[PDB]
Amino acid sequence: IIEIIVVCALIFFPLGYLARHSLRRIRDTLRLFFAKPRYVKPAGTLR
Amino acid sequence: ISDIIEIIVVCALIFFPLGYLARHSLRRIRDTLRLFFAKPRYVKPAGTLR
Amino acid sequence: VDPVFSIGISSLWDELRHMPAGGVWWFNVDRHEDAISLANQTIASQAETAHVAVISMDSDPAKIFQLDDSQGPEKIKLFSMLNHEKGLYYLTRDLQCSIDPHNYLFILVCANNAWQNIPAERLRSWLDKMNKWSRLNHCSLLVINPGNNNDKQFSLLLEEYRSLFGLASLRFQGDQHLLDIAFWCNEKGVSARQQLSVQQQNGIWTLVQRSDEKRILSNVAVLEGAPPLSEHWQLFNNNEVLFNEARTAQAATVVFSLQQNAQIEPLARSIHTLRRQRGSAMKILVRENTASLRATDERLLLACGANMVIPWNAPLSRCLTMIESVQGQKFSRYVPEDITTLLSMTQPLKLRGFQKWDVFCNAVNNMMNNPLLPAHGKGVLVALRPVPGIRVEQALTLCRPNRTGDIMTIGGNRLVLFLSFCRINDLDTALNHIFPLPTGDIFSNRMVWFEDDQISAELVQMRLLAPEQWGMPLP
Amino acid sequence: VDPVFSIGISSLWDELRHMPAGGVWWFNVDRHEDAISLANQTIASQAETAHVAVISMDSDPAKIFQLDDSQGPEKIKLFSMLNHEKGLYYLTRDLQCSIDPHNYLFILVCANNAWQNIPAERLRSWLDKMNKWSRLNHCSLLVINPGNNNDKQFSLLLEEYRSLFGLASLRFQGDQHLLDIAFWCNEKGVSARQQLSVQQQNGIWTLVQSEEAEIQPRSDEKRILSNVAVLEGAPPLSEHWQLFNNNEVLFNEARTAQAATVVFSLQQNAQIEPLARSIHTLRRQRGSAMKILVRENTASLRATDERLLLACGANMVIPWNAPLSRCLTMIESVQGQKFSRYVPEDITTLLSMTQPLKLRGFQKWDVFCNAVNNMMNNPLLPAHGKGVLVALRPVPGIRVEQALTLCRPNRTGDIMTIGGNRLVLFLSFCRINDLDTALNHIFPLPTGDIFSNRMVWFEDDQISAELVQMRLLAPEQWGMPLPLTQSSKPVINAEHDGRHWRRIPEPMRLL
Ligand SMILES: Nc1nc2c(ncn2[C@@H]2O[C@@H]3COP(=O)(O)O[C@H]4[C@@H](O)[C@H](n5cnc6c(=O)[nH]c(N)nc65)O[C@@H]4COP(=O)(O)O[C@H]3[C@H]2O)c(=O)[nH]1
Ligand SMILES: Nc1nc2c(ncn2[C@@H]2O[C@@H]3COP(=O)(O)O[C@H]4[C@@H](O)[C@H](n5cnc6c(=O)[nH]c(N)nc65)O[C@@H]4COP(=O)(O)O[C@H]3[C@H]2O)c(=O)[nH]1
Ligand SMILES: Nc1nc2c(ncn2[C@@H]2O[C@@H]3COP(=O)(O)O[C@H]4[C@@H](O)[C@H](n5cnc6c(=O)[nH]c(N)nc65)O[C@@H]4COP(=O)(O)O[C@H]3[C@H]2O)c(=O)[nH]1
Ligand SMILES: Nc1nc2c(ncn2[C@@H]2O[C@@H]3COP(=O)(O)O[C@H]4[C@@H](O)[C@H](n5cnc6c(=O)[nH]c(N)nc65)O[C@@H]4COP(=O)(O)O[C@H]3[C@H]2O)c(=O)[nH]1
């Protein structure tokens, strides 16, 4: 009931805090995945 | 059972922005808390040596 | 922890060569091919395990960039950006899409005059953001810019020395290149304002490593019928014997005499040899007796190693005081080893008389892009609007240039002249020499451009004139 | 808008003394008393309106630090902290507790070897945080570190350029202190790797006279700061040209330049001496990279005044004979040249060198010989260019005292005397090439109608020999001026209209 609601709240508070601390990491990974290069297109790794 | 899960999800949801805004405004919160009283320790002003 | 990278210059000191992993460095080049060569060598000098990327405005970097077989990284990643300033603005995010930039060296080789249109404020903001990003990601950025006229931009870079970790320049001087390091910051300290000489052999940039002070050696003609002033004066009949005796001298004062125009070319060579074999202690003066000089020839003599050229307007007493002026002074200017590259600057146009619109514009643009010519002093571009009652063809009839580097064109009810090496103050005299009737009864208005940027802008607005608005002399 | 603070060293270049707001500067000093002296001088060196605060350890700053009544800010706010690392950590927020540090200058005077207990990584983090804080708050921090031995710390700071605008050390070496500037950055560029000799004279740190060529940044090597009269109404040739109305404003602007060509304009002789003073000041404060040019526009100069301007520090004086195009070419002829001559500290000696005789007219034999000998015994005058000594033999029709009546010198340094049927005359700062011009100015126009022959001496040894021969003349043969009662009648048909010898026609009968 209320007790488990408080427990879930407690869980989520530092969970979201740690999620915010890793904002830069999240943005970097999302940019790697989504991969929208608008003007700079890699021509290719040359040997 | 279902209502329990629904309430759990609601609590989860409402509390995610809570910890998001708590970190986002943390620096401003600290700045305000310093402004009010904090504890100006260690370095102590001697005086205005005119 | 973070590694150090190395610039693509051979035999460079460790203070001026290293590049720690956090920061931004800027390098300016005179020509595009030199920028490409320096970029290739910089890629070639790196360690095998290092991470390197190259970003180039020109398409297909796989065709213009190469790798060294003996050493260098196993692979480099190429990026291409369209000819848009938004490419530079988005560079950081666009790279984040494709690379994790921890200890990555980014060589950015821009196109020719690529940074010419970027506003000052946005360039400052770009530099600040690049410095912040580099320090955050522990990546280093090397910017190589082939440009032509970056004085204002170079001043901006100097004022923004907090964003940069190093600023250097490479200027073409015929047979050798001049490396001017404004500042360089490394783990070994900070270096300030060094001037060094670098040469390219087989495509590789390698760095190229009290007794008679009161004596005065002079031509006889310098003293117009006057006794030798002191014991320290030796009088010679011509400049040939003066050159032979000055060969032995070390810190003596040599005063040549310019009586005739034909002497300018050999005098230049003599001064060159005297300033090469004998160092900066010697003082070389050219006393001009008769009016036998142009501004261009005086610039040539100054570049060949003369301290100053004394005009014929100055009488003997003023010349003697000027001879007193140069005493105690050393010649700090650089004299290029090649002599032909100095004499080639005497006349760079070699086109006389009427030219069509396109050939005129191409010739003037080519002269404007020449690196081995004085800045803001290459010539004067004039557009003359004829008075009503006479046409531009009739104005072309009454227009006879005399020098070699003077060209004309007619188009759009304008007569556009270019006069080479003429200064803006001495423009009306030139126009009086060219036209038979006074300028003022033939033309209504005069537009004049004499600075490099102004002439370039006028040329780019002169190509917009569609044909059938051009003109030719009536047969 | 933000202030530019200064380090407490006198005669130090603006390149190594200015500290713009928004940075952290590091000072390593050898002795605590030297540290306190430098801190006090830096306190006194600031502007009156400047806001300065001091932070000290293990003492009351109100008793150890002093303010000057003639120079410095009106008031300073002191701070003291316990000898702890926690204070070094909390400094920023503790200071933010009291005053909002906008455009303030914090002098951090530490205890002896206080930074010996701080580990490397925490020191680097502290420097980064202080750099960030200074940039945000537009305040400057000056860390004065007394240290017996901080070689490893000095190396760590050497690597840490990205957090400091300047790193300097001050080491005592028995008789003088050496100021070793590793790198210094201000609004005027970056200076690096300089060793200087400084001394504490009357408790004030000063640079010994070893300025040489130490202005490393030459950002304005192409800027041309010139009087508006130099360009004869012509357009500014390039964007590098900045014109000025007079030499006073141009001088004020040029005191902040490094390697800019400064072209003055001279139109009257009344403007020579102050121009000389200004040039002396510029060459004494802005080093040898500058190009100082004096451009004559009207006839307003002698050879001696040109020598004065050259000896004050000017590279070249452009004669008014040269037209504008030749002047511009001569301006570009001096680019990239360093002034390697020696400019003395005292301008008074140079000003006195422009006229060392100060005696005009007839003289006795003794006075003439002694004056010329003293002129040639002055070791501050150009060799073989001091003047011309000329002995004139009169024509048979006239005597020697009459010839004395016929000479009226105009310049101050011209003297003459009569002896042994020889009118001998010394014209100071006259060249042998222009002796006839001077004689024509001080005699009736044809000098062959008053003198048969002349003997000229224009070299120092020659004039000394002639004076030695003249001193041997018996006193009985010396001459005296004729009284005005008998000199009223003209010897020749000439008269003096103040400064012009006009020849009066006389009646005569033709053959
Ligand atoms: N008043 C005046 N007239 C000018 C000027 N520039 C050119 N001219 C006239 O143009 C003629 C041809 O000059 P050019 O084709 O440059 O061909 C010139 C040029 O190659 C050479 N030359 C003469 N004086 C000089 C000089 O001082 N410097 C250089 N570099 N060449 C000179 O001699 C050639 C023939 O000279 P000229 O027989 O005298 O004939 C000259 C002269 O009448 C100028 O600045 N002022
Ligand atoms: N592009 C161009 N510019 C022209 C022309 N005529 C005159 N100028 C410009 O006018 C300046 C002064 O010419 P000036 O008073 O006749 O004074 C001239 C003239 O008396 C003499 N000079 C130079 N070249 C020649 C030449 O080829 N022949 C003769 N006879 N005199 C020359 O040297 C003086 C200095 O000449 P600069 O220093 O070169 O400076 C020259 C030059 O910049 C022309 O036809 N084309
Ligand atoms: N043509 C000619 N005349 C000469 C020369 N030297 C002296 N004079 C004449 O001598 C007068 C008095 O000169 P001063 O006693 O030295 O006293 C001079 C001197 O102190 C000063 N002065 C004028 N022009 C100059 C100058 O170019 N340089 C300096 N240093 N002083 C000058 O002004 C005073 C009065 O000058 P003025 O009224 O012009 O009157 C001058 C002038 O008529 C010379 O080389 N050429
Ligand atoms: N001791 C002495 N020397 C004399 C006298 N008159 C002429 N000289 C010498 O003759 C040189 C040329 O004088 P200038 O041709 O009249 O040409 C003079 C003249 O035009 C002008 N100038 C100099 N002082 C005065 C002055 O006091 N008044 C005026 N009006 N002009 C002066 O400056 C030019 C250059 O003068 P400087 O460089 O000094 O060089 C002078 C100086 O060495 C004189 O009375 N006494």
Numbering used by the authors:
A (entry chain F): 7 to 53
B (entry chain S): 4 to 53
C (entry chain E): 5 to 213, 222 to 487
D (entry chain U): 5 to 515
Sentences copied from the publication:
Bacterial cellulosic polymers constitute a prevalent class of biofilm matrix exopolysaccharides that are synthesized by several types of bacterial cellulose secretion (Bcs) systems, which include conserved cyclic diguanylate (c-di-GMP)-dependent cellulose synthase modules together with diverse accessory subunits. Here we present cryo-EM structures of the E. coli Bcs macrocomplex positioning all seven BcsRQABEFG partners and multiple c-di-GMP-binding sites.
Here we show BcsE and BcsF interact in an asymmetric and heterotetrameric BcsE2F2 complex. In particular, BcsF adopts an X-shaped dimeric conformation within the inner membrane, stabilized by a hydrophobic N-proximal transmembrane interface burying 626 Å2 of surface area with free energy gain of −15.5 kcal/mol. At the C-termini, each BcsF protomer recruits a BcsE partner copy via cytosolic β-sheet complementation interactions with the central 9-stranded β-sheet of the interacting BcsENTD. The BcsF C-terminal tail threads along a shallow hydrophobic patch onto BcsE’s degenerate NTPase* domain and provides an overall charged solvent-exposed surface for the assembly (∼837 Å buried interface with free energy gain of −12.9 kcal/mol). The cryo-EM structures presented here are consistent with the previously characterized tripartite architecture of BcsE, comprising a degenerate trio of an NTPase*, REC*, and GGDEF* domains. Nevertheless, rather than engaging in head-to-tail interactions as proposed previously based on indirect BACTH interaction assays, the two BcsENTD modules pack against each other in a head-to-head dimer, stabilized primarily by hydrophobic and π–stacking interactions in the center and by the peripheral BcsF C-terminal tails at the periphery (747 Å buried with free energy gain of −2.7 kcal/mol at the BcsENTD dimer interface). However the REC* domains, which are not in contact in the crystallized states, engage in head-to-head dimerization interactions mediated by a α4–β5–α5 interface, observed as a canonical REC domain dimerization interface in many phosphorylation competent response regulators. An intercalated c-di-GMP dimer is found at each cis-interdomain interface of a closed BcsE21, stabilized by a composite R306ATD-R415TGD I-site tandem contributed by the corresponding REC* and GGDEF* domains, respectively (see below).
